[PDB]
Amino acid sequence: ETLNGGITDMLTELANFEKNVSQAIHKYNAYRKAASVIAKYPHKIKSGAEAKKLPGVGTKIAEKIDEFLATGKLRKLEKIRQDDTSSSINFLTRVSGIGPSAARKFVDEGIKTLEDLRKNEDKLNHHQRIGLKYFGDFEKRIPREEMLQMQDIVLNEVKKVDSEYIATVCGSFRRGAESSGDMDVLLTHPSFTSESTKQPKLLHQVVEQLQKVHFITDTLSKGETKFMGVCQLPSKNDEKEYPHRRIDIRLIPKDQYYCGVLYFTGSDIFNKNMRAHALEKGFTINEYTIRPLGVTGVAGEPLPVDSEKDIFDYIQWKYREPKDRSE
DNA sequence: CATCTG
DNA sequence: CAGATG
Ligand SMILES: [Mn+2]
Ligand SMILES: [Mn+2]
Ligand code: NA
Ligand code: NA
């Protein structure tokens, strides 16, 4: 956690680099398990050889661990942090819509920068276009103080369209969190479930309302259950307009809301722990449901849930206010 | 995993 | 349809 800090970090830059710039999924993948095991490793790695001894640690990595330990640096890392082509790829990638792949295409055409991008708005696609337009806003975190206003808006319009909708804003926003990255809303309706063969209007209606009133500005992607958009809190009394924010809306069969809701509320760590305990208490948990564990090795059958309460109970545990769901 | 692009 | 992105 700090005993093998550099090592794990350098290794990460390496892995990261393989995948992003080059294509080296194997290699990239190699660096990964590698930092993971050393990450768990209980002592102070005093040398390459020492390391090698670990699984996932071959000669090539050991080689590296040496030079890094031998000198505060690594040539390879040094050579990579320089190289403009690498850098460009890490940058283009910041735009929502541009992945590695595309980063590579663009650079190999000379687009390496924002302007580059602007001058060639033709080559970019709609998502990427939005992305480029809101690059700035996009990186701006979302302060809880806005979160609450947003939340307030969304819940009110959903209510209006149908009293039966059930909306929930998950995310750390849900866990306390002073600011957040994007607005994550979980949605269901009674008339929508596991079996109940579809109902897309279910999602489409609300989507409309939000735009109706301008909360929603652009559509990144709009499927029948998931929607990736852009929204914005109305600018009050002109002098101060709000940054454009990322927002996601998702339909869920009522029969699996809370596991979902639980799940999205995180944190990853709280999930895991809960999940493990679930297992002890003879259970199974995932995104959508909780199941009774047979002894034959495994087994299923959807345990019925009516709240997040229902779940804990099942695994016979302490109801956790979302706040303390931290770890 | 759900959506898009081409 | 594969393949990319989130
Ligand atoms: Mn979030
Ligand atoms: Mn999001
Ligand atoms: Na080994
Ligand atoms: Na991106």
mmCIF file of C-alpha atoms in Angstrom, chain A residues 5-323:
data_model
loop_
_atom_site.group_PDB
_atom_site.id
_atom_site.type_symbol
_atom_site.label_atom_id
_atom_site.label_comp_id
_atom_site.label_asym_id
_atom_site.label_seq_id
_atom_site.Cartn_x
_atom_site.Cartn_y
_atom_site.Cartn_z
ATOM 1 C CA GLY A 5 4.366 2.061 -4.249
ATOM 2 C CA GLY A 6 6.743 3.064 -7.042
ATOM 3 C CA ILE A 7 6.959 -0.396 -8.344
ATOM 4 C CA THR A 8 3.289 -0.667 -8.576
ATOM 5 C CA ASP A 9 3.009 2.710 -10.072
ATOM 6 C CA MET A 10 5.763 2.390 -12.661
ATOM 7 C CA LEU A 11 4.343 -0.972 -13.637
ATOM 8 C CA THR A 12 1.034 0.717 -14.075
ATOM 9 C CA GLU A 13 2.491 3.407 -16.463
ATOM 10 C CA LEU A 14 3.987 0.566 -18.384
ATOM 11 C CA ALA A 15 0.786 -1.420 -18.584
ATOM 12 C CA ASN A 16 -1.154 1.688 -19.415
ATOM 13 C CA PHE A 17 1.178 2.510 -22.055
ATOM 14 C CA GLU A 18 1.064 -0.883 -23.752
ATOM 15 C CA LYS A 19 -2.625 -0.915 -24.187
ATOM 16 C CA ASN A 20 -3.193 2.817 -25.097
ATOM 17 C CA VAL A 21 -0.270 3.532 -27.466
ATOM 18 C CA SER A 22 0.877 0.195 -28.655
ATOM 19 C CA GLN A 23 -1.589 -2.475 -28.868
ATOM 20 C CA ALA A 24 0.088 -4.920 -26.402
ATOM 21 C CA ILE A 25 -2.972 -6.248 -24.625
ATOM 22 C CA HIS A 26 -0.935 -9.204 -23.473
ATOM 23 C CA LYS A 27 1.859 -7.034 -22.306
ATOM 24 C CA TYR A 28 -0.469 -4.578 -20.854
ATOM 25 C CA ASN A 29 -2.233 -7.382 -19.210
ATOM 26 C CA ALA A 30 1.163 -8.609 -18.089
ATOM 27 C CA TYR A 31 1.944 -5.402 -16.181
ATOM 28 C CA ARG A 32 -1.338 -5.704 -14.492
ATOM 29 C CA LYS A 33 -1.292 -8.900 -12.584
ATOM 30 C CA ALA A 34 2.235 -7.914 -11.952
ATOM 31 C CA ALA A 35 1.446 -4.751 -10.027
ATOM 32 C CA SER A 36 -1.384 -6.554 -8.389
ATOM 33 C CA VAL A 37 0.719 -9.294 -6.836
ATOM 34 C CA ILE A 38 3.413 -6.918 -5.725
ATOM 35 C CA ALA A 39 0.605 -4.796 -4.454
ATOM 36 C CA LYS A 40 -0.414 -7.554 -2.132
ATOM 37 C CA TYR A 41 3.212 -8.449 -1.316
ATOM 38 C CA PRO A 42 3.860 -8.015 2.341
ATOM 39 C CA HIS A 43 7.472 -6.853 2.306
ATOM 40 C CA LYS A 44 9.854 -4.371 0.861
ATOM 41 C CA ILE A 45 11.049 -5.444 -2.500
ATOM 42 C CA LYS A 46 14.743 -5.057 -2.241
ATOM 43 C CA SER A 47 15.604 -6.395 -5.615
ATOM 44 C CA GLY A 48 14.533 -7.712 -8.895
ATOM 45 C CA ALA A 49 15.301 -11.345 -8.106
ATOM 46 C CA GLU A 50 13.235 -11.033 -5.005
ATOM 47 C CA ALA A 51 10.388 -10.001 -7.124
ATOM 48 C CA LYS A 52 10.744 -12.588 -9.833
ATOM 49 C CA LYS A 53 9.970 -15.019 -7.145
ATOM 50 C CA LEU A 54 6.488 -13.782 -7.378
ATOM 51 C CA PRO A 55 3.947 -15.136 -9.843
ATOM 52 C CA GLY A 56 3.291 -12.971 -12.853
ATOM 53 C CA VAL A 57 6.809 -11.783 -12.403
ATOM 54 C CA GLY A 58 9.066 -12.748 -15.106
ATOM 55 C CA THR A 59 12.494 -11.706 -16.256
ATOM 56 C CA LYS A 60 11.385 -8.651 -18.200
ATOM 57 C CA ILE A 61 9.612 -7.114 -15.272
ATOM 58 C CA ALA A 62 12.323 -7.990 -12.859
ATOM 59 C CA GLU A 63 14.781 -6.308 -15.219
ATOM 60 C CA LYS A 64 12.822 -3.173 -14.844
ATOM 61 C CA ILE A 65 12.336 -3.384 -11.121
ATOM 62 C CA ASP A 66 16.087 -3.480 -10.886
ATOM 63 C CA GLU A 67 16.859 -0.208 -12.757
ATOM 64 C CA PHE A 68 14.091 1.509 -11.098
ATOM 65 C CA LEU A 69 15.260 0.468 -7.673
ATOM 66 C CA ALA A 70 18.818 0.975 -8.739
ATOM 67 C CA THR A 71 18.034 4.587 -9.988
ATOM 68 C CA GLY A 72 14.964 6.854 -9.416
ATOM 69 C CA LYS A 73 14.042 6.248 -12.939
ATOM 70 C CA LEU A 74 13.392 4.016 -15.853
ATOM 71 C CA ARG A 75 14.679 4.828 -19.415
ATOM 72 C CA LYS A 76 11.607 3.362 -20.958
ATOM 73 C CA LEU A 77 9.356 5.453 -18.799
ATOM 74 C CA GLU A 78 11.632 8.308 -19.559
ATOM 75 C CA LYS A 79 11.543 7.747 -23.316
ATOM 76 C CA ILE A 80 7.618 7.380 -23.285
ATOM 77 C CA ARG A 81 6.818 10.505 -21.108
ATOM 78 C CA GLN A 82 8.609 12.437 -23.781
ATOM 79 C CA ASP A 83 7.494 11.112 -27.102
ATOM 80 C CA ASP A 84 4.890 13.256 -28.503
ATOM 81 C CA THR A 85 3.008 10.465 -30.238
ATOM 82 C CA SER A 86 2.450 8.764 -26.913
ATOM 83 C CA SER A 87 1.384 11.995 -25.294
ATOM 84 C CA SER A 88 -1.030 12.826 -27.937
ATOM 85 C CA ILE A 89 -2.796 9.617 -27.539
ATOM 86 C CA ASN A 90 -3.210 10.245 -23.832
ATOM 87 C CA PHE A 91 -4.663 13.535 -24.534
ATOM 88 C CA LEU A 92 -7.016 12.891 -27.392
ATOM 89 C CA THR A 93 -8.456 10.201 -25.220
ATOM 90 C CA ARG A 94 -9.700 12.880 -22.759
ATOM 91 C CA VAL A 95 -12.426 13.783 -25.123
ATOM 92 C CA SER A 96 -15.584 11.871 -24.470
ATOM 93 C CA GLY A 97 -16.001 9.686 -27.408
ATOM 94 C CA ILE A 98 -12.376 9.189 -28.271
ATOM 95 C CA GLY A 99 -10.856 5.917 -27.128
ATOM 96 C CA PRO A 100 -7.483 4.594 -27.836
ATOM 97 C CA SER A 101 -8.358 3.307 -31.150
ATOM 98 C CA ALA A 102 -9.561 6.549 -32.443
ATOM 99 C CA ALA A 103 -6.725 8.381 -30.688
ATOM 100 C CA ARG A 104 -4.435 6.399 -32.851
ATOM 101 C CA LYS A 105 -6.361 7.139 -36.046
ATOM 102 C CA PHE A 106 -6.444 10.846 -35.377
ATOM 103 C CA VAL A 107 -2.784 11.168 -34.592
ATOM 104 C CA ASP A 108 -1.803 9.250 -37.476
ATOM 105 C CA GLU A 109 -3.481 11.926 -39.468
ATOM 106 C CA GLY A 110 -1.935 14.763 -37.523
ATOM 107 C CA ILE A 111 -4.763 15.496 -35.124
ATOM 108 C CA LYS A 112 -3.041 15.767 -31.888
ATOM 109 C CA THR A 113 -4.731 18.612 -30.324
ATOM 110 C CA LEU A 114 -7.922 20.383 -29.545
ATOM 111 C CA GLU A 115 -7.595 22.767 -32.396
ATOM 112 C CA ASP A 116 -6.702 19.804 -34.527
ATOM 113 C CA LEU A 117 -9.943 18.417 -33.520
ATOM 114 C CA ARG A 118 -11.893 21.594 -34.083
ATOM 115 C CA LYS A 119 -10.469 22.052 -37.583
ATOM 116 C CA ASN A 120 -11.607 18.603 -38.344
ATOM 117 C CA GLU A 121 -14.928 18.465 -36.728
ATOM 118 C CA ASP A 122 -15.887 16.679 -39.846
ATOM 119 C CA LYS A 123 -14.005 13.512 -38.915
ATOM 120 C CA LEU A 124 -15.518 13.310 -35.512
ATOM 121 C CA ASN A 125 -18.873 11.693 -34.840
ATOM 122 C CA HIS A 126 -21.823 13.146 -32.827
ATOM 123 C CA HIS A 127 -20.732 11.819 -29.383
ATOM 124 C CA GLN A 128 -17.244 12.955 -30.079
ATOM 125 C CA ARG A 129 -18.630 16.183 -31.234
ATOM 126 C CA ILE A 130 -20.416 16.799 -28.087
ATOM 127 C CA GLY A 131 -17.362 15.723 -26.249
ATOM 128 C CA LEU A 132 -15.266 18.264 -27.995
ATOM 129 C CA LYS A 133 -17.761 21.022 -27.451
ATOM 130 C CA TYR A 134 -17.925 20.392 -23.737
ATOM 131 C CA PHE A 135 -14.293 19.372 -23.082
ATOM 132 C CA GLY A 136 -13.886 21.941 -20.396
ATOM 133 C CA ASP A 137 -17.204 21.380 -18.567
ATOM 134 C CA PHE A 138 -16.580 17.732 -18.948
ATOM 135 C CA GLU A 139 -13.574 17.684 -16.730
ATOM 136 C CA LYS A 140 -15.190 19.953 -14.121
ATOM 137 C CA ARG A 141 -16.387 18.102 -11.109
ATOM 138 C CA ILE A 142 -19.982 18.479 -9.908
ATOM 139 C CA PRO A 143 -20.434 20.095 -6.515
ATOM 140 C CA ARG A 144 -23.122 18.636 -4.279
ATOM 141 C CA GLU A 145 -24.707 22.018 -4.119
ATOM 142 C CA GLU A 146 -25.652 21.653 -7.823
ATOM 143 C CA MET A 147 -26.259 17.944 -7.501
ATOM 144 C CA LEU A 148 -29.167 18.717 -5.100
ATOM 145 C CA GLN A 149 -30.642 21.289 -7.515
ATOM 146 C CA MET A 150 -30.379 18.778 -10.348
ATOM 147 C CA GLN A 151 -31.812 16.008 -8.273
ATOM 148 C CA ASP A 152 -34.586 18.331 -7.414
ATOM 149 C CA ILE A 153 -35.348 18.941 -10.980
ATOM 150 C CA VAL A 154 -35.254 15.401 -12.171
ATOM 151 C CA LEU A 155 -37.389 14.030 -9.385
ATOM 152 C CA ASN A 156 -39.971 16.642 -9.876
ATOM 153 C CA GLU A 157 -40.443 16.068 -13.599
ATOM 154 C CA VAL A 158 -40.440 12.316 -13.311
ATOM 155 C CA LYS A 159 -43.173 12.635 -10.715
ATOM 156 C CA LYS A 160 -45.271 14.700 -13.048
ATOM 157 C CA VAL A 161 -45.127 12.339 -15.946
ATOM 158 C CA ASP A 162 -46.214 9.480 -13.746
ATOM 159 C CA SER A 163 -46.623 9.174 -9.969
ATOM 160 C CA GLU A 164 -45.623 5.646 -10.275
ATOM 161 C CA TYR A 165 -42.094 6.272 -11.389
ATOM 162 C CA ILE A 166 -39.410 5.571 -8.940
ATOM 163 C CA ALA A 167 -36.195 7.463 -9.427
ATOM 164 C CA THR A 168 -32.988 7.270 -7.516
ATOM 165 C CA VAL A 169 -29.718 9.114 -7.796
ATOM 166 C CA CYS A 170 -26.985 6.767 -7.032
ATOM 167 C CA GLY A 171 -23.344 7.446 -7.089
ATOM 168 C CA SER A 172 -21.260 8.900 -4.369
ATOM 169 C CA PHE A 173 -23.790 11.663 -4.435
ATOM 170 C CA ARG A 174 -25.850 9.019 -2.697
ATOM 171 C CA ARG A 175 -22.891 8.151 -0.407
ATOM 172 C CA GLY A 176 -22.345 11.679 0.897
ATOM 173 C CA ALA A 177 -19.630 12.900 -1.487
ATOM 174 C CA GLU A 178 -19.049 16.683 -1.669
ATOM 175 C CA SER A 179 -18.789 16.685 -5.417
ATOM 176 C CA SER A 180 -19.191 14.186 -8.138
ATOM 177 C CA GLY A 181 -18.306 13.387 -11.654
ATOM 178 C CA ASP A 182 -21.715 12.721 -13.316
ATOM 179 C CA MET A 183 -25.402 12.434 -12.501
ATOM 180 C CA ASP A 184 -26.418 8.742 -12.291
ATOM 181 C CA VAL A 185 -30.127 8.068 -12.177
ATOM 182 C CA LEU A 186 -31.748 4.572 -11.661
ATOM 183 C CA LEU A 187 -35.257 4.295 -12.857
ATOM 184 C CA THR A 188 -38.150 1.804 -12.729
ATOM 185 C CA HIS A 189 -41.812 1.683 -12.790
ATOM 186 C CA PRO A 190 -44.155 -0.969 -11.456
ATOM 187 C CA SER A 191 -45.375 -1.815 -14.809
ATOM 188 C CA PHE A 192 -41.871 -2.885 -15.865
ATOM 189 C CA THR A 193 -40.265 -6.072 -14.984
ATOM 190 C CA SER A 194 -38.166 -9.161 -15.392
ATOM 191 C CA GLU A 195 -40.746 -10.884 -17.476
ATOM 192 C CA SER A 196 -43.049 -8.009 -18.538
ATOM 193 C CA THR A 197 -42.209 -7.790 -22.106
ATOM 194 C CA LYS A 198 -40.885 -4.347 -22.639
ATOM 195 C CA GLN A 199 -42.080 -0.808 -22.434
ATOM 196 C CA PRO A 200 -39.638 1.698 -23.986
ATOM 197 C CA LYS A 201 -41.943 4.665 -23.647
ATOM 198 C CA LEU A 202 -41.301 4.009 -20.029
ATOM 199 C CA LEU A 203 -37.910 5.598 -20.496
ATOM 200 C CA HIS A 204 -38.528 7.755 -23.516
ATOM 201 C CA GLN A 205 -41.248 9.734 -21.876
ATOM 202 C CA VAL A 206 -39.178 11.081 -19.169
ATOM 203 C CA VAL A 207 -36.280 11.692 -21.413
ATOM 204 C CA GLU A 208 -38.491 14.010 -23.296
ATOM 205 C CA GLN A 209 -39.799 15.862 -20.297
ATOM 206 C CA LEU A 210 -36.324 16.655 -19.151
ATOM 207 C CA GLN A 211 -35.477 18.082 -22.538
ATOM 208 C CA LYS A 212 -38.906 19.581 -22.588
ATOM 209 C CA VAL A 213 -37.894 21.845 -19.879
ATOM 210 C CA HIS A 214 -34.277 22.118 -20.988
ATOM 211 C CA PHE A 215 -32.707 20.247 -18.282
ATOM 212 C CA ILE A 216 -31.477 17.916 -20.894
ATOM 213 C CA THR A 217 -29.488 19.501 -23.623
ATOM 214 C CA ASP A 218 -27.939 16.839 -25.823
ATOM 215 C CA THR A 219 -28.211 13.157 -26.407
ATOM 216 C CA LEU A 220 -25.053 11.085 -26.462
ATOM 217 C CA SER A 221 -26.842 7.791 -26.789
ATOM 218 C CA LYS A 222 -30.436 6.864 -26.401
ATOM 219 C CA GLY A 223 -31.339 3.174 -26.357
ATOM 220 C CA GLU A 224 -34.424 1.574 -24.936
ATOM 221 C CA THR A 225 -33.221 1.325 -21.440
ATOM 222 C CA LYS A 226 -30.203 3.432 -21.192
ATOM 223 C CA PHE A 227 -29.682 6.925 -22.041
ATOM 224 C CA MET A 228 -26.420 8.895 -22.130
ATOM 225 C CA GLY A 229 -27.019 12.591 -22.229
ATOM 226 C CA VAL A 230 -25.956 16.145 -21.258
ATOM 227 C CA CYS A 231 -27.885 18.392 -18.972
ATOM 228 C CA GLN A 232 -27.849 21.723 -17.423
ATOM 229 C CA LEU A 233 -29.190 23.719 -14.590
ATOM 230 C CA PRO A 234 -30.787 26.752 -15.941
ATOM 231 C CA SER A 235 -28.781 29.846 -15.677
ATOM 232 C CA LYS A 236 -30.608 31.918 -12.986
ATOM 233 C CA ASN A 237 -30.440 35.620 -13.694
ATOM 234 C CA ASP A 238 -27.807 35.771 -16.443
ATOM 235 C CA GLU A 239 -24.265 36.488 -15.381
ATOM 236 C CA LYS A 240 -23.552 32.943 -14.280
ATOM 237 C CA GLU A 241 -24.579 29.957 -16.568
ATOM 238 C CA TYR A 242 -23.805 26.416 -15.346
ATOM 239 C CA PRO A 243 -21.365 24.009 -16.808
ATOM 240 C CA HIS A 244 -22.789 21.342 -19.053
ATOM 241 C CA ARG A 245 -22.907 18.015 -17.146
ATOM 242 C CA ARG A 246 -22.900 14.343 -17.890
ATOM 243 C CA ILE A 247 -25.959 12.424 -17.086
ATOM 244 C CA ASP A 248 -27.270 8.909 -17.368
ATOM 245 C CA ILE A 249 -30.699 7.474 -17.015
ATOM 246 C CA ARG A 250 -31.565 3.812 -16.834
ATOM 247 C CA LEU A 251 -34.672 1.737 -16.904
ATOM 248 C CA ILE A 252 -34.972 -1.206 -14.622
ATOM 249 C CA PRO A 253 -37.545 -3.768 -14.043
ATOM 250 C CA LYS A 254 -39.083 -2.996 -10.712
ATOM 251 C CA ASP A 255 -38.288 -6.587 -9.684
ATOM 252 C CA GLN A 256 -34.631 -5.730 -9.519
ATOM 253 C CA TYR A 257 -34.331 -2.076 -8.573
ATOM 254 C CA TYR A 258 -32.793 -2.265 -5.118
ATOM 255 C CA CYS A 259 -30.052 -4.764 -6.053
ATOM 256 C CA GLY A 260 -29.341 -2.365 -8.796
ATOM 257 C CA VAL A 261 -29.759 0.554 -6.589
ATOM 258 C CA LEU A 262 -27.632 -0.996 -4.064
ATOM 259 C CA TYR A 263 -25.058 -1.953 -6.431
ATOM 260 C CA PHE A 264 -24.674 1.497 -8.190
ATOM 261 C CA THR A 265 -24.487 3.158 -4.841
ATOM 262 C CA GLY A 266 -21.118 1.426 -4.290
ATOM 263 C CA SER A 267 -18.445 1.732 -3.211
ATOM 264 C CA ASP A 268 -16.693 -1.048 -5.098
ATOM 265 C CA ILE A 269 -15.170 -1.946 -1.709
ATOM 266 C CA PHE A 270 -18.480 -1.908 0.067
ATOM 267 C CA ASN A 271 -19.815 -4.048 -2.669
ATOM 268 C CA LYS A 272 -17.183 -6.574 -2.454
ATOM 269 C CA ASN A 273 -17.315 -6.857 1.327
ATOM 270 C CA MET A 274 -21.023 -7.132 1.296
ATOM 271 C CA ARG A 275 -20.782 -9.589 -1.497
ATOM 272 C CA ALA A 276 -18.368 -11.753 0.382
ATOM 273 C CA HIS A 277 -20.435 -11.771 3.534
ATOM 274 C CA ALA A 278 -23.491 -12.547 1.336
ATOM 275 C CA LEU A 279 -21.585 -15.651 0.411
ATOM 276 C CA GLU A 280 -20.906 -16.591 3.953
ATOM 277 C CA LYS A 281 -24.532 -16.198 4.915
ATOM 278 C CA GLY A 282 -25.231 -18.744 2.084
ATOM 279 C CA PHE A 283 -25.891 -16.207 -0.751
ATOM 280 C CA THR A 284 -25.239 -14.657 -4.032
ATOM 281 C CA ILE A 285 -25.282 -11.085 -5.167
ATOM 282 C CA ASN A 286 -24.895 -9.132 -8.377
ATOM 283 C CA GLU A 287 -26.173 -6.127 -10.134
ATOM 284 C CA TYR A 288 -29.814 -7.493 -10.374
ATOM 285 C CA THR A 289 -30.588 -10.013 -7.672
ATOM 286 C CA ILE A 290 -29.723 -12.024 -4.592
ATOM 287 C CA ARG A 291 -29.814 -15.781 -4.541
ATOM 288 C CA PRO A 292 -29.887 -18.598 -2.017
ATOM 289 C CA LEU A 293 -26.829 -20.709 -2.371
ATOM 290 C CA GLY A 294 -27.433 -24.427 -2.855
ATOM 291 C CA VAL A 295 -24.795 -26.766 -1.488
ATOM 292 C CA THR A 296 -24.133 -28.825 -4.666
ATOM 293 C CA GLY A 297 -21.592 -26.203 -5.409
ATOM 294 C CA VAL A 298 -24.037 -23.637 -6.502
ATOM 295 C CA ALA A 299 -27.597 -22.914 -7.268
ATOM 296 C CA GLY A 300 -30.102 -20.116 -7.814
ATOM 297 C CA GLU A 301 -33.609 -18.661 -7.557
ATOM 298 C CA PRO A 302 -34.319 -14.923 -7.128
ATOM 299 C CA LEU A 303 -34.836 -13.907 -3.618
ATOM 300 C CA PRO A 304 -37.568 -11.228 -3.554
ATOM 301 C CA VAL A 305 -36.576 -7.666 -2.608
ATOM 302 C CA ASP A 306 -38.690 -4.601 -1.565
ATOM 303 C CA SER A 307 -35.910 -2.246 -0.462
ATOM 304 C CA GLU A 308 -32.208 -2.277 0.270
ATOM 305 C CA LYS A 309 -33.446 -3.430 3.609
ATOM 306 C CA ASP A 310 -34.645 -6.639 2.189
ATOM 307 C CA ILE A 311 -31.140 -7.442 1.078
ATOM 308 C CA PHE A 312 -29.052 -6.792 4.204
ATOM 309 C CA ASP A 313 -31.623 -8.652 6.190
ATOM 310 C CA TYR A 314 -31.152 -11.612 3.941
ATOM 311 C CA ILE A 315 -27.492 -11.722 4.524
ATOM 312 C CA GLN A 316 -28.380 -10.923 8.103
ATOM 313 C CA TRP A 317 -26.518 -7.694 8.412
ATOM 314 C CA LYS A 318 -26.483 -4.185 9.645
ATOM 315 C CA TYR A 319 -28.540 -1.782 7.523
ATOM 316 C CA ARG A 320 -26.105 0.556 6.172
ATOM 317 C CA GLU A 321 -27.012 4.096 5.653
ATOM 318 C CA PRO A 322 -25.572 4.966 2.319
ATOM 319 C CA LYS A 323 -23.248 7.443 3.969
#
